[PDB]
Design an enzyme around this catalytic site. Structure first.
Site, PDB file in Angstrom:
ATOM      1  N   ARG A  62       0.821  -1.211   0.000  1.00  0.00           N
ATOM      2  CA  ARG A  62       0.000   0.000   0.000  1.00  0.00           C
ATOM      3  C   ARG A  62       0.854   1.260   0.000  1.00  0.00           C
ATOM      4  O   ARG A  62       0.466   2.264  -0.596  1.00  0.00           O
ATOM      5  CB  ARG A  62      -0.953   0.024   1.197  1.00  0.00           C
ATOM      6  CG  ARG A  62      -1.984  -1.097   1.234  1.00  0.00           C
ATOM      7  CD  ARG A  62      -2.743  -1.224  -0.081  1.00  0.00           C
ATOM      8  NE  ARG A  62      -3.748  -2.292  -0.078  1.00  0.00           N
ATOM      9  CZ  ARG A  62      -3.499  -3.540  -0.439  1.00  0.00           C
ATOM     10  NH1 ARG A  62      -2.271  -3.941  -0.728  1.00  0.00           N
ATOM     11  NH2 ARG A  62      -4.499  -4.421  -0.486  1.00  0.00           N
ATOM     12  N   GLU A  92       1.854   1.730  -3.497  1.00  0.00           N
ATOM     13  CA  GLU A  92       0.733   2.237  -4.279  1.00  0.00           C
ATOM     14  C   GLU A  92       0.539   3.737  -4.072  1.00  0.00           C
ATOM     15  O   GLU A  92       0.169   4.448  -5.018  1.00  0.00           O
ATOM     16  CB  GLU A  92      -0.549   1.475  -3.922  1.00  0.00           C
ATOM     17  CG  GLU A  92      -1.738   1.944  -4.721  1.00  0.00           C
ATOM     18  CD  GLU A  92      -2.904   0.997  -4.608  1.00  0.00           C
ATOM     19  OE1 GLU A  92      -2.840  -0.055  -5.273  1.00  0.00           O
ATOM     20  OE2 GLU A  92      -3.889   1.312  -3.881  1.00  0.00           O
ATOM     21  N   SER A 118      14.596  15.195   1.620  1.00  0.00           N
ATOM     22  CA  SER A 118      15.598  14.199   1.962  1.00  0.00           C
ATOM     23  C   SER A 118      14.984  12.955   2.592  1.00  0.00           C
ATOM     24  O   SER A 118      14.031  13.029   3.374  1.00  0.00           O
ATOM     25  CB  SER A 118      16.608  14.812   2.927  1.00  0.00           C
ATOM     26  OG  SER A 118      17.618  13.877   3.256  1.00  0.00           O
TER      27      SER A 118
END
EC number: 4.2.1.104
Lengths: 156, 156, 156, 156, 156, 156, 156, 156, 156, 156
Positions: free
Chosen positions: A96, A99, A122
């Site tokens: 997830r 995604e 960063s």
């Protein structure tokens, strides 16, 4: 610390042993990191082979988990980082987060350049935390905060 | 909306056209989203092919960007999502978010299971936002908030 | 509960040992699951490294299969999920289910958005079962039911 | 029908054109398939390049969508099947069905061999349907039925 | 047989041992299959981890090759099929069969659809044999016969 | 013929045009190859970009398909062979032939070395044909004959 | 020889042992091949798992390298060929020969078809030799000779 | 001289145009290079996008092929080299030279280090030629000479 | 000298052992290289499997690190080079050097061709060093010098 | 500059147009950058799609190369960076810089951690330059200086 690793399998094999010992002692990651002075996400990442522990913290968690002397030393070495087996996670929980990058990756780029300018946020000068909150509609939510320094890209 | 796309190139080609129009008009994503009632990350993601705009919002941003009728329709269509060209970003700005997964992916999994249990943090019932804050040691930082519903995994 | 794995090889090695014991004892998955109160597909998936068993069921299936105490504990850990060796199955039996995605993947997307809206059919709030039925024209068919909750994608 | 394709891009480009016509005409896939005598998943798959329509159904959907003669003929050709851009879906809606395979692929193999024997469940002698139902707990669920013939593997 | 494998390495490691014993005993695949009632291609495939032997054949070939009882059981298990290390063969002998696909794959599709219709030639309801014949121009030829059932793809 | 191609897209684009004309004229590959003196599999493969037609056959099929002069020339050029889009077919009909290699590739290697010795069965000095026959159990089968010269590997 | 291998790791593991014995004994590949009656490239390739030695040569190099009887037998087995770890060499010395194909691969194709016709230059009916010569401008050069039979591709 | 390319598609598209012109004029690569003072392998590689021609050679071949002035200039630019579409050739004629690397790659490494020392045989200080010779057993052979300078790897 | 490796895992396993001994002894790479007469980048590269040490240097570092005799021999063998596990580094420290090639790789090509001509900057006749310097704005910088011979590409 | 790109193809297509105009005008990158006050590596990178030019420099180089107004604007936008076509370069000149990573990547990591500590050498706070120097043994060398800030990884 000037010592570093080049083969992630060494620390990741240690991670598996840590996890088994951790399960046998019914320990949490919050409990393990308690008393180290270090955030749970940093200490957890170290156990899982992705950060280096200072000597004092290494001896503390090594005692908690019954680790031998070689393993306590290994936790202090700078790791060869990279926790994903083969670039893209297969695990649903980990996937997830990938995604989110597939859906919002270009939006993150666009909004970083709009608010800060050319350059990066960063992943090194960087802090992460995970908080559980109530959902007003029922159930629970995770509020995961990524806190990275802006590094500009300027002409030279 | 019941209409959906299957080839991401259509919406991504529209995104390139939107970006050129946006640059020619000196517009920011925040001001494009102003007056839509929608978060800048959501509207930006729609322009970049990764969300569907409701009709009123699609017409408003279409007016600001001088989009034609087919383009205003396209922004309302459910997309074939996936903004990364080939699975792993080449761009440094988006790569750092992939690197946070390579370093902390297993820590995120471990802390999610610790605090919530088996299951996932959703990328669907999900909000994100980017805030700029001052770094007390000098410079600027991005605080990026991922806010997802916990969905549990239980036996059946 | 709160313990989880990060390297799928641990549970997948356990699955191989489980399959040997099962074969030596002439056991079916249906009868390993019998008495757990859990569906055969859930218990089978757990044995194969893709779900966590509750303590009572892990002790029960571990008795049937003569597992040592570490193996019974590993069965209760939240797994690092992903059963496919290298993204696309080579085995014909599993390949056919991948082929159904190559042929009907975009149709599933289209019909899900038509009937439900933008969003997903969950693989987490999800169950499946396999049923054997007679083919009127001779032989047998498998009726495999995928049953997942609709999670909407909404503007924010 | 003895005519077949070798390059999926021809029918997939047609699919994009069909989707635009469908959206401009505010039509659903159920509406387009009504009157063909064919199931909505079959007709939808054909529009999206993954099945061949019989001549009468091709003419009927071509009238509904105002398709030209070459398009109506293309819909009757046997396709070069494969709807996924690059092996693994990026789109969340489509990805969930792949994740079902990553979690349950070996369980489906195991249960197919236990209930039927060595061999496969067919993706060719095969019917698919998607059904929207009420979630008894609130909301909606998709019940997706994969109905394939068992083909045995036997010695020779 | 209701037992099946999920990790091809187990049967492939057995195959390596079988090949060593076969080499030490100076046996051919034809001799090993003699007396089983099964085709040399089928028995050979089983030894090499790609088919399951019935119990009587497993005991006969196991006696011929001096296999232990765990090995004789393993040969009866339904395999996790897939003999190619990493998708494309490196071995010249195996590669030539892949090259036949690269050269004639679309021709096979086109001619199958022309003679049979939409659908497949089965690799499951399928028989294979290798015959040595003299080349009238000098030398020898292999005539390799692939014999598969046609399964039609029909509307529904 | 001494002219050759280095970019397969040229001949594959021609193949798509050939297939459209073939479809419009309701022609089969068997009748396109009629009168050429060449096997249907060889002529079909040339139309699909995988072989070179002699000048006489190129003119003959060029008239049947109403091809322009440059096209008839292209069909005579030595191609850059390789019909598979990206190494592994997605199309079920072509995939089955790949699956036969995944199941029997090592069996084919073993039986070739047993019957012939070290070396290969050629894909160059090679012919193939597809025959439709009755299935004695009911239905139809394809008997696909691969006929290749044995080339030995000898010490030097 | 009718015995063959299917897992390259067996002979590659043997190659590593051969290399260690060879280094401990201060032997060159030229010295090992001396007296076999076979070219140094052929014998070296067999030691490294890519060719099969006749029995007399196998016993001879086995004596020179103090190999055990199982190893001398393994050297006589027909190998599963392919010496490159993962398709493209990482080693600079090996990579330069891959780069020669990236630069000249299409030129080699073009010139083979111009001088010989359609078809291939064989990698099976094939000899290789490496010759060290002086560079007239200072230093040394390798003249590597690839000597392969032309096999024509002809209509049928 | 100092101008260079970064996108191989520009010169490879030019190569396709060159091949079409060459085919219409019935030219060989030997005749195109004739009168340049450059080896046929070098001139051919330049036409195919893998070398740069001097101005005199570029106008000369450009006149033979009726190239426009932009094309004659492009042939003089330093190319972005790499003739293989996607790392491993699909074309049988080119594949054989890759297979020689799969079979003899490590032998080439071992013999280079034996005869010359640590380092490489150069692909830059490098010449190749293709010669047709008669096979005393009947037929023809290609003798391909790779001639590269030894560059040593030395401590510093 | 004349002995070389073909399996990088042997020297890379030795590297892991060296790193463990090095950390136990609290040694730096600078100290290990002291007294060898060789640059720290060259000696370090040898320890990590990517260069061959001359005999005297191998014995010196072997004494410092308490290596056995087989290990001191291994360090003198010519390696199978390639330190990256799978083509692209996961480790952030190593990845930044890959990112400089994603950003500047075509600029390096362009400026090499402008300043030197067609050809390459050698990675073989090549030295590198890493220097720590003050950042004039505060902090520290690495100045990494790549010093490679220009090898021209000229016609032949 | 708040405007940014998401599809590298836009700026890379512009780069090809720039290179053609540059070649027609007989211009070097040094003289294109002359008068911008910007380093030749930075301006070159911007032309090749990997940096953003400030407005004044974009107008100056646009005048020099006869770029249209859309192109001058595009050079000012923040790019989607990544110059390598498919992860690993095919071009020899570019590949040598990748090979330096394959040989010295772990050495660079080890020496960075030894001299600076845990963390990275920045690719963002970063400059590079290419210098030609005489080789005292004859010929020329390139001294390429990579100059990046050290960013520490600290516990939190």
């Amino acid at each position: 610390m000037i010592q570093s690793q080049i083969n992630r399998n060494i620390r990741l094999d240690l991670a598996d042993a840590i996890l088994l010992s951790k399960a046998k002692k019914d320990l949490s990651f919050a409990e393990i990191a308690d008393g180290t002075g270090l955030a749970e996400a940093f200490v957890t990442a170290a156990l899982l082979g992705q950060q280096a522990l200072p000597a004092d913290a290494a001896r503390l968690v090594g005692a908690k988990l019954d680790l031998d002397e070689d393993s306590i030393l290994l936790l202090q070495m700078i790791p060869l980082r990279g926790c994903i087996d083969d670039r893209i996670p297969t695990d649903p929980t980990m996937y997830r987060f990938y995604e989110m990058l597939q859906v919002y990756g270009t939006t993150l780029k666009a909004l970083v350049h709009e608010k800060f300018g050319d350059g990066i946020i960063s992943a090194i000068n960087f802090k992460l935390d995970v908080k559980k909150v109530a959902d007003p509609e029922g159930g629970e939510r995770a509020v995961i905060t990524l806190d990275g320094k802006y590094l500009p890209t300027k002409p030279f």
